[PDB]
């Protein structure tokens, strides 16, 4: 599913991401925009053989099992395919574990490079929440 900006903001808010570990909603919507362009079905292969999955491009080296990343850790305890669903619940629950891991949202390279220190509130502007 390809989410609209405000539709995704609303779903993320409902799933408890607004101010989760201090990160306002706009940060999460910005990260999703540049990681996956709001497409739950996005996949991207990394040079190390791991793959990133879904709206927040969660990586198979640590977070999920895809059956093809030797020495992967499956920390969210979830097949990576579950992260591609039109229901964002699995992605959100896994992202909560990731952002709690000590590096905050710096775990998402597009967030560091494209969202961090920008006016992220613009991403929720005009939305009914």
Our CB check for Pt ion shows the closer of 8 and 99 to be 8
Q: Which residues are annotated as a binding site?
A: 101
> By the 8 A CB rule, do 55 and 98 touch?
no
Cα(60)–Cα(79) distance, rounded to whole angstroms? 9
CB of 21 to Pt ion, least distance (A): 20
Which of the residues 7, 18, 52, 119 is marked catalytic? Answer: 52
User: Binding mask 9-38 vs Pt ion (x if CB under 5 A, - otherwise)?
Assistant: -xx---------------------------
CB of 96 to Pt ion, least distance (A): 14
Q: Is 70 exposed, middle or buried (0-12, 13-18, 19+ CB in 10 A)?
A: exposed
| Cα Rg of the chain, angstroms | 14
Q: Does 72 bind Pt ion (CB under 5 A)?
A: yes
Q: Does 59 bind Pt ion (CB under 5 A)?
A: no
> By the 8 A CB rule, do 51 and 66 touch?
yes
Question: What residues line the site for Pt ion (CB under 5 A)?
Answer: 10-11, 65, 69, 72
């Amino acid at each position: 599913k390809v989410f609209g900006r405000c539709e995704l903001a609303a779903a993320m808010k409902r799933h408890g991401l607004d101010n989760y570990r201090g990160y306002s909603l706009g940060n999460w919507v910005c990260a999703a925009k540049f990681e996956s362009n709001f497409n739950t079905q996005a996949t991207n292969r990394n040079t190390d053989g791991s793959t990133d999955y879904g709206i927040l491009q969660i990586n198979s080296r640590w977070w999920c099992n895809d059956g093809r990343t030797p020495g992967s850790r499956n920390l969210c305890n979830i097949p990576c395919s579950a992260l591609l669903s039109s229901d964002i619940t699995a992605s959100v629950n896994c992202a909560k574990k990731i952002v709690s891991d000590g590096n905050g949202m710096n775990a998402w390279v597009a967030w560091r490079n494209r969202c961090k220190g920008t006016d992220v509130q613009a991403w929720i502007r005009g939305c009914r929440l």
